[PDB]
Amino acid sequence: DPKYADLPGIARNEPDVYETSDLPLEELTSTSVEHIIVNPNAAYDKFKDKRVGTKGLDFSDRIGKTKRTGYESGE
Amino acid sequence: IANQPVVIDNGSGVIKAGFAGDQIPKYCFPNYVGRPKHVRVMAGALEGDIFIGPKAEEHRGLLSIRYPMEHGIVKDWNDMERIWQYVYSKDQLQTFSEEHPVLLTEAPLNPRKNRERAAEVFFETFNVPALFISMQAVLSLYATGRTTGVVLDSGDGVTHAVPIYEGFAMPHSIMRIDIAGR
């Protein structure tokens, strides 16, 4: 504010801001696929009581037995 | 005390079953054992590691099918134990082996070890009260209602002929070759 009187070249009637007028998905609806609504509650209730037995399993490239099938037991 | 006996008809490829006094074998399933080939990964897959019955046919591409009875001779006794338990399981008969007599069927001219081990299975694992191993020609004569005849059968693995005249079988004219359906 007092920079007008103490300084010579600080003019008035200056529009400080020169501006312009501040002027103001469809792929899932296909007939090919069957869109499924994912529900974590229903799927969680489905796989709620299904155990997995990991007693002595392997997945690596170890060849000692004939075959190798991990996740043997359940409930 | 005695109950309605179970007719556990064997077979090299198809094992029939059903209680006595019936007219249709209500529980027929192939005589093979299916165990998974691939690796179980997901949680909530098929469980059991041994699949016998219609479930095995339902998942043929997932199981390594192997027959335990080759040419009428049982080659895998453990698999036959599983199969006979499946016969008494809660999917085919839903009964107990301790409450029913067993009518087992065998092909003629079989090795004695099959009869002896079948006896030990049905009398040490299954606590069956009474077992009677019979032939297969005489039974077809009973089914047709005749008394005479040359029963020429051809199972999955054994073709044989047993000529029987007026209810009398001739144990020396029995031919048997191990060349059949399988």
PDB file of all heavy atoms in Angstrom, chain A residues 3-29:
ATOM      1  N   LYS A   3       3.718   1.872  -1.147  1.00  0.00           N
ATOM      2  CA  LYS A   3       4.738   1.803  -2.182  1.00  0.00           C
ATOM      3  C   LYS A   3       4.424   2.703  -3.366  1.00  0.00           C
ATOM      4  O   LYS A   3       5.203   2.743  -4.323  1.00  0.00           O
ATOM      5  CB  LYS A   3       4.907   0.351  -2.651  1.00  0.00           C
ATOM      6  CG  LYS A   3       5.555  -0.551  -1.599  1.00  0.00           C
ATOM      7  CD  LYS A   3       4.527  -1.281  -0.735  1.00  0.00           C
ATOM      8  CE  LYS A   3       5.193  -2.055   0.379  1.00  0.00           C
ATOM      9  NZ  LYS A   3       5.780  -1.098   1.361  1.00  0.00           N
ATOM     10  N   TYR A   4       3.304   3.422  -3.315  1.00  0.00           N
ATOM     11  CA  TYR A   4       2.863   4.326  -4.367  1.00  0.00           C
ATOM     12  C   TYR A   4       3.451   5.717  -4.182  1.00  0.00           C
ATOM     13  O   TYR A   4       3.923   6.337  -5.139  1.00  0.00           O
ATOM     14  CB  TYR A   4       1.334   4.463  -4.355  1.00  0.00           C
ATOM     15  CG  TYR A   4       0.507   3.205  -4.526  1.00  0.00           C
ATOM     16  CD1 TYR A   4      -0.816   3.181  -4.093  1.00  0.00           C
ATOM     17  CD2 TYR A   4       1.033   2.048  -5.084  1.00  0.00           C
ATOM     18  CE1 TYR A   4      -1.593   2.053  -4.223  1.00  0.00           C
ATOM     19  CE2 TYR A   4       0.266   0.914  -5.217  1.00  0.00           C
ATOM     20  CZ  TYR A   4      -1.048   0.920  -4.788  1.00  0.00           C
ATOM     21  OH  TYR A   4      -1.826  -0.207  -4.915  1.00  0.00           O
ATOM     22  N   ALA A   5       3.403   6.213  -2.945  1.00  0.00           N
ATOM     23  CA  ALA A   5       3.874   7.558  -2.627  1.00  0.00           C
ATOM     24  C   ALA A   5       5.398   7.619  -2.606  1.00  0.00           C
ATOM     25  O   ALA A   5       6.006   8.540  -3.165  1.00  0.00           O
ATOM     26  CB  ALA A   5       3.306   8.016  -1.293  1.00  0.00           C
ATOM     27  N   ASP A   6       6.038   6.650  -1.949  1.00  0.00           N
ATOM     28  CA  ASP A   6       7.492   6.650  -1.826  1.00  0.00           C
ATOM     29  C   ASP A   6       8.225   6.323  -3.120  1.00  0.00           C
ATOM     30  O   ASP A   6       9.424   6.605  -3.216  1.00  0.00           O
ATOM     31  CB  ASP A   6       7.913   5.657  -0.750  1.00  0.00           C
ATOM     32  CG  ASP A   6       7.463   6.072   0.630  1.00  0.00           C
ATOM     33  OD1 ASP A   6       7.330   7.290   0.868  1.00  0.00           O
ATOM     34  OD2 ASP A   6       7.238   5.182   1.477  1.00  0.00           O
ATOM     35  N   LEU A   7       7.557   5.734  -4.107  1.00  0.00           N
ATOM     36  CA  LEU A   7       8.248   5.394  -5.339  1.00  0.00           C
ATOM     37  C   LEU A   7       7.624   6.106  -6.535  1.00  0.00           C
ATOM     38  O   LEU A   7       6.397   6.198  -6.631  1.00  0.00           O
ATOM     39  CB  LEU A   7       8.230   3.882  -5.542  1.00  0.00           C
ATOM     40  CG  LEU A   7       9.067   3.164  -4.485  1.00  0.00           C
ATOM     41  CD1 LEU A   7       8.805   1.670  -4.470  1.00  0.00           C
ATOM     42  CD2 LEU A   7      10.538   3.455  -4.745  1.00  0.00           C
ATOM     43  N   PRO A   8       8.443   6.631  -7.451  1.00  0.00           N
ATOM     44  CA  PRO A   8       7.905   7.369  -8.605  1.00  0.00           C
ATOM     45  C   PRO A   8       7.150   6.580  -9.671  1.00  0.00           C
ATOM     46  O   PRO A   8       6.016   6.935 -10.009  1.00  0.00           O
ATOM     47  CB  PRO A   8       9.163   8.006  -9.215  1.00  0.00           C
ATOM     48  CG  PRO A   8      10.292   7.118  -8.791  1.00  0.00           C
ATOM     49  CD  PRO A   8       9.918   6.615  -7.430  1.00  0.00           C
ATOM     50  N   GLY A   9       7.759   5.524 -10.212  1.00  0.00           N
ATOM     51  CA  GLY A   9       7.180   4.747 -11.296  1.00  0.00           C
ATOM     52  C   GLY A   9       6.045   3.809 -10.939  1.00  0.00           C
ATOM     53  O   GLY A   9       5.460   3.228 -11.860  1.00  0.00           O
ATOM     54  N   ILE A  10       5.711   3.633  -9.663  1.00  0.00           N
ATOM     55  CA  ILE A  10       4.621   2.726  -9.300  1.00  0.00           C
ATOM     56  C   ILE A  10       3.321   3.448  -9.637  1.00  0.00           C
ATOM     57  O   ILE A  10       2.837   4.277  -8.866  1.00  0.00           O
ATOM     58  CB  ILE A  10       4.676   2.313  -7.830  1.00  0.00           C
ATOM     59  CG1 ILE A  10       6.058   1.760  -7.493  1.00  0.00           C
ATOM     60  CG2 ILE A  10       3.608   1.284  -7.529  1.00  0.00           C
ATOM     61  CD1 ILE A  10       6.500   0.614  -8.336  1.00  0.00           C
ATOM     62  N   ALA A  11       2.758   3.139 -10.797  1.00  0.00           N
ATOM     63  CA  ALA A  11       1.535   3.783 -11.237  1.00  0.00           C
ATOM     64  C   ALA A  11       0.301   3.097 -10.661  1.00  0.00           C
ATOM     65  O   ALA A  11       0.363   2.022 -10.060  1.00  0.00           O
ATOM     66  CB  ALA A  11       1.465   3.803 -12.764  1.00  0.00           C
ATOM     67  N   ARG A  12      -0.835   3.749 -10.857  1.00  0.00           N
ATOM     68  CA  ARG A  12      -2.138   3.278 -10.431  1.00  0.00           C
ATOM     69  C   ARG A  12      -2.948   2.968 -11.684  1.00  0.00           C
ATOM     70  O   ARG A  12      -2.421   3.039 -12.803  1.00  0.00           O
ATOM     71  CB  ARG A  12      -2.824   4.312  -9.539  1.00  0.00           C
ATOM     72  CG  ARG A  12      -2.168   4.531  -8.184  1.00  0.00           C
ATOM     73  CD  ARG A  12      -2.943   5.577  -7.399  1.00  0.00           C
ATOM     74  NE  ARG A  12      -2.366   5.851  -6.090  1.00  0.00           N
ATOM     75  CZ  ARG A  12      -1.447   6.785  -5.863  1.00  0.00           C
ATOM     76  NH1 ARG A  12      -0.994   7.528  -6.865  1.00  0.00           N
ATOM     77  NH2 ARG A  12      -0.976   6.975  -4.637  1.00  0.00           N
ATOM     78  N   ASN A  13      -4.230   2.623 -11.483  1.00  0.00           N
ATOM     79  CA  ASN A  13      -5.179   2.262 -12.548  1.00  0.00           C
ATOM     80  C   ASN A  13      -4.649   1.099 -13.381  1.00  0.00           C
ATOM     81  O   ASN A  13      -4.854   1.034 -14.595  1.00  0.00           O
ATOM     82  CB  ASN A  13      -5.514   3.462 -13.442  1.00  0.00           C
ATOM     83  CG  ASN A  13      -6.240   4.559 -12.693  1.00  0.00           C
ATOM     84  OD1 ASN A  13      -7.123   4.290 -11.877  1.00  0.00           O
ATOM     85  ND2 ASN A  13      -5.867   5.808 -12.960  1.00  0.00           N
ATOM     86  N   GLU A  14      -3.948   0.185 -12.715  1.00  0.00           N
ATOM     87  CA  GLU A  14      -3.326  -0.949 -13.357  1.00  0.00           C
ATOM     88  C   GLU A  14      -4.153  -2.198 -13.137  1.00  0.00           C
ATOM     89  O   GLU A  14      -4.293  -2.629 -11.981  1.00  0.00           O
ATOM     90  CB  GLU A  14      -1.930  -1.162 -12.782  1.00  0.00           C
ATOM     91  CG  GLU A  14      -0.984   0.009 -12.934  1.00  0.00           C
ATOM     92  CD  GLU A  14       0.345  -0.239 -12.249  1.00  0.00           C
ATOM     93  OE1 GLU A  14       0.483  -1.285 -11.579  1.00  0.00           O
ATOM     94  OE2 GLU A  14       1.244   0.620 -12.364  1.00  0.00           O
ATOM     95  N   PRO A  15      -4.714  -2.811 -14.185  1.00  0.00           N
ATOM     96  CA  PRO A  15      -5.440  -4.069 -13.989  1.00  0.00           C
ATOM     97  C   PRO A  15      -4.379  -5.115 -13.708  1.00  0.00           C
ATOM     98  O   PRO A  15      -3.645  -5.505 -14.619  1.00  0.00           O
ATOM     99  CB  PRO A  15      -6.146  -4.294 -15.330  1.00  0.00           C
ATOM    100  CG  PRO A  15      -6.226  -2.929 -15.942  1.00  0.00           C
ATOM    101  CD  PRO A  15      -4.971  -2.229 -15.512  1.00  0.00           C
ATOM    102  N   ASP A  16      -4.267  -5.532 -12.443  1.00  0.00           N
ATOM    103  CA  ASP A  16      -3.223  -6.474 -12.041  1.00  0.00           C
ATOM    104  C   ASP A  16      -3.341  -7.830 -12.717  1.00  0.00           C
ATOM    105  O   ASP A  16      -2.323  -8.489 -12.955  1.00  0.00           O
ATOM    106  CB  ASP A  16      -3.225  -6.649 -10.521  1.00  0.00           C
ATOM    107  CG  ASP A  16      -2.696  -5.426  -9.793  1.00  0.00           C
ATOM    108  OD1 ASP A  16      -1.874  -4.693 -10.380  1.00  0.00           O
ATOM    109  OD2 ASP A  16      -3.095  -5.201  -8.633  1.00  0.00           O
ATOM    110  N   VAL A  17      -4.550  -8.268 -13.037  1.00  0.00           N
ATOM    111  CA  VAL A  17      -4.743  -9.563 -13.666  1.00  0.00           C
ATOM    112  C   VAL A  17      -5.380  -9.378 -15.032  1.00  0.00           C
ATOM    113  O   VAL A  17      -6.525  -8.920 -15.138  1.00  0.00           O
ATOM    114  CB  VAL A  17      -5.589 -10.501 -12.789  1.00  0.00           C
ATOM    115  CG1 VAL A  17      -5.898 -11.792 -13.536  1.00  0.00           C
ATOM    116  CG2 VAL A  17      -4.858 -10.799 -11.487  1.00  0.00           C
ATOM    117  N   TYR A  18      -4.637  -9.738 -16.070  1.00  0.00           N
ATOM    118  CA  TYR A  18      -5.111  -9.721 -17.444  1.00  0.00           C
ATOM    119  C   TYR A  18      -5.490 -11.166 -17.715  1.00  0.00           C
ATOM    120  O   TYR A  18      -4.625 -12.046 -17.687  1.00  0.00           O
ATOM    121  CB  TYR A  18      -4.033  -9.245 -18.415  1.00  0.00           C
ATOM    122  CG  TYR A  18      -3.698  -7.780 -18.323  1.00  0.00           C
ATOM    123  CD1 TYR A  18      -2.613  -7.344 -17.571  1.00  0.00           C
ATOM    124  CD2 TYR A  18      -4.458  -6.831 -18.995  1.00  0.00           C
ATOM    125  CE1 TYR A  18      -2.294  -6.006 -17.491  1.00  0.00           C
ATOM    126  CE2 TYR A  18      -4.148  -5.487 -18.923  1.00  0.00           C
ATOM    127  CZ  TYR A  18      -3.065  -5.082 -18.166  1.00  0.00           C
ATOM    128  OH  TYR A  18      -2.749  -3.747 -18.086  1.00  0.00           O
ATOM    129  N   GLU A  19      -6.772 -11.424 -17.942  1.00  0.00           N
ATOM    130  CA  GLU A  19      -7.186 -12.802 -18.117  1.00  0.00           C
ATOM    131  C   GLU A  19      -8.200 -12.965 -19.234  1.00  0.00           C
ATOM    132  O   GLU A  19      -8.593 -12.012 -19.915  1.00  0.00           O
ATOM    133  CB  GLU A  19      -7.774 -13.342 -16.810  1.00  0.00           C
ATOM    134  CG  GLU A  19      -9.069 -12.647 -16.424  1.00  0.00           C
ATOM    135  CD  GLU A  19      -9.611 -13.104 -15.092  1.00  0.00           C
ATOM    136  OE1 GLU A  19      -8.951 -13.933 -14.432  1.00  0.00           O
ATOM    137  OE2 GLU A  19     -10.704 -12.638 -14.707  1.00  0.00           O
ATOM    138  N   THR A  20      -8.614 -14.216 -19.394  1.00  0.00           N
ATOM    139  CA  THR A  20      -9.598 -14.682 -20.350  1.00  0.00           C
ATOM    140  C   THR A  20     -10.799 -15.197 -19.573  1.00  0.00           C
ATOM    141  O   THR A  20     -10.749 -15.362 -18.350  1.00  0.00           O
ATOM    142  CB  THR A  20      -9.024 -15.800 -21.226  1.00  0.00           C
ATOM    143  OG1 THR A  20      -8.816 -16.966 -20.421  1.00  0.00           O
ATOM    144  CG2 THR A  20      -7.686 -15.384 -21.800  1.00  0.00           C
ATOM    145  N   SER A  21     -11.885 -15.459 -20.290  1.00  0.00           N
ATOM    146  CA  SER A  21     -13.086 -15.975 -19.650  1.00  0.00           C
ATOM    147  C   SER A  21     -12.859 -17.430 -19.269  1.00  0.00           C
ATOM    148  O   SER A  21     -12.525 -18.253 -20.128  1.00  0.00           O
ATOM    149  CB  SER A  21     -14.285 -15.845 -20.583  1.00  0.00           C
ATOM    150  OG  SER A  21     -14.149 -16.705 -21.702  1.00  0.00           O
ATOM    151  N   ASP A  22     -13.027 -17.749 -17.986  1.00  0.00           N
ATOM    152  CA  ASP A  22     -12.833 -19.121 -17.536  1.00  0.00           C
ATOM    153  C   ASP A  22     -14.031 -19.927 -18.018  1.00  0.00           C
ATOM    154  O   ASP A  22     -15.039 -20.054 -17.315  1.00  0.00           O
ATOM    155  CB  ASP A  22     -12.674 -19.186 -16.014  1.00  0.00           C
ATOM    156  CG  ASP A  22     -12.070 -20.500 -15.542  1.00  0.00           C
ATOM    157  OD1 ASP A  22     -11.778 -21.370 -16.392  1.00  0.00           O
ATOM    158  OD2 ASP A  22     -11.876 -20.657 -14.317  1.00  0.00           O
ATOM    159  N   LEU A  23     -13.919 -20.452 -19.232  1.00  0.00           N
ATOM    160  CA  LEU A  23     -14.998 -21.209 -19.840  1.00  0.00           C
ATOM    161  C   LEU A  23     -15.196 -22.550 -19.136  1.00  0.00           C
ATOM    162  O   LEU A  23     -14.220 -23.194 -18.736  1.00  0.00           O
ATOM    163  CB  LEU A  23     -14.707 -21.431 -21.323  1.00  0.00           C
ATOM    164  CG  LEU A  23     -14.712 -20.155 -22.167  1.00  0.00           C
ATOM    165  CD1 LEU A  23     -14.291 -20.452 -23.591  1.00  0.00           C
ATOM    166  CD2 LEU A  23     -16.082 -19.499 -22.139  1.00  0.00           C
ATOM    167  N   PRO A  24     -16.451 -23.000 -18.970  1.00  0.00           N
ATOM    168  CA  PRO A  24     -16.752 -24.280 -18.323  1.00  0.00           C
ATOM    169  C   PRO A  24     -16.397 -25.478 -19.204  1.00  0.00           C
ATOM    170  O   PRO A  24     -15.462 -26.212 -18.883  1.00  0.00           O
ATOM    171  CB  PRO A  24     -18.263 -24.206 -18.088  1.00  0.00           C
ATOM    172  CG  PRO A  24     -18.761 -23.277 -19.142  1.00  0.00           C
ATOM    173  CD  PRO A  24     -17.680 -22.261 -19.325  1.00  0.00           C
ATOM    174  N   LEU A  25     -15.695 -47.982 -19.309  1.00  0.00           N
ATOM    175  CA  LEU A  25     -16.735 -46.969 -19.420  1.00  0.00           C
ATOM    176  C   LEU A  25     -17.771 -47.492 -20.424  1.00  0.00           C
ATOM    177  O   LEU A  25     -18.775 -48.080 -20.022  1.00  0.00           O
ATOM    178  CB  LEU A  25     -16.128 -45.625 -19.844  1.00  0.00           C
ATOM    179  CG  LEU A  25     -16.828 -44.300 -19.511  1.00  0.00           C
ATOM    180  CD1 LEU A  25     -18.016 -43.980 -20.406  1.00  0.00           C
ATOM    181  CD2 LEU A  25     -17.242 -44.286 -18.040  1.00  0.00           C
ATOM    182  N   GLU A  26     -17.533 -47.299 -21.722  1.00  0.00           N
ATOM    183  CA  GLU A  26     -18.439 -47.796 -22.758  1.00  0.00           C
ATOM    184  C   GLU A  26     -17.842 -48.992 -23.475  1.00  0.00           C
ATOM    185  O   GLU A  26     -18.046 -49.191 -24.678  1.00  0.00           O
ATOM    186  CB  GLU A  26     -18.801 -46.700 -23.756  1.00  0.00           C
ATOM    187  CG  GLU A  26     -19.721 -45.629 -23.198  1.00  0.00           C
ATOM    188  CD  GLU A  26     -21.104 -46.159 -22.848  1.00  0.00           C
ATOM    189  OE1 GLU A  26     -21.598 -47.068 -23.549  1.00  0.00           O
ATOM    190  OE2 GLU A  26     -21.694 -45.671 -21.862  1.00  0.00           O
ATOM    191  N   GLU A  27     -17.092 -49.804 -22.730  1.00  0.00           N
ATOM    192  CA  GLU A  27     -16.436 -50.987 -23.256  1.00  0.00           C
ATOM    193  C   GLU A  27     -16.853 -52.252 -22.537  1.00  0.00           C
ATOM    194  O   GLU A  27     -16.673 -53.343 -23.085  1.00  0.00           O
ATOM    195  CB  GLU A  27     -14.910 -50.840 -23.157  1.00  0.00           C
ATOM    196  CG  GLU A  27     -14.349 -49.636 -23.909  1.00  0.00           C
ATOM    197  CD  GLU A  27     -14.343 -48.369 -23.071  1.00  0.00           C
ATOM    198  OE1 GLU A  27     -14.671 -48.451 -21.868  1.00  0.00           O
ATOM    199  OE2 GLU A  27     -14.037 -47.291 -23.616  1.00  0.00           O
ATOM    200  N   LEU A  28     -17.409 -52.133 -21.334  1.00  0.00           N
ATOM    201  CA  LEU A  28     -17.870 -53.284 -20.579  1.00  0.00           C
ATOM    202  C   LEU A  28     -19.254 -53.735 -21.021  1.00  0.00           C
ATOM    203  O   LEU A  28     -19.649 -54.869 -20.727  1.00  0.00           O
ATOM    204  CB  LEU A  28     -17.893 -52.947 -19.092  1.00  0.00           C
ATOM    205  CG  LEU A  28     -16.532 -52.549 -18.522  1.00  0.00           C
ATOM    206  CD1 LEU A  28     -16.648 -52.169 -17.052  1.00  0.00           C
ATOM    207  CD2 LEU A  28     -15.517 -53.656 -18.730  1.00  0.00           C
ATOM    208  N   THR A  29     -19.991 -52.878 -21.723  1.00  0.00           N
ATOM    209  CA  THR A  29     -21.337 -53.183 -22.207  1.00  0.00           C
ATOM    210  C   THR A  29     -21.301 -53.878 -23.565  1.00  0.00           C
ATOM    211  O   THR A  29     -21.961 -53.460 -24.515  1.00  0.00           O
ATOM    212  CB  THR A  29     -22.159 -51.902 -22.285  1.00  0.00           C
ATOM    213  OG1 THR A  29     -21.581 -51.033 -23.267  1.00  0.00           O
ATOM    214  CG2 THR A  29     -22.165 -51.187 -20.946  1.00  0.00           C
TER     215      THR A  29
END
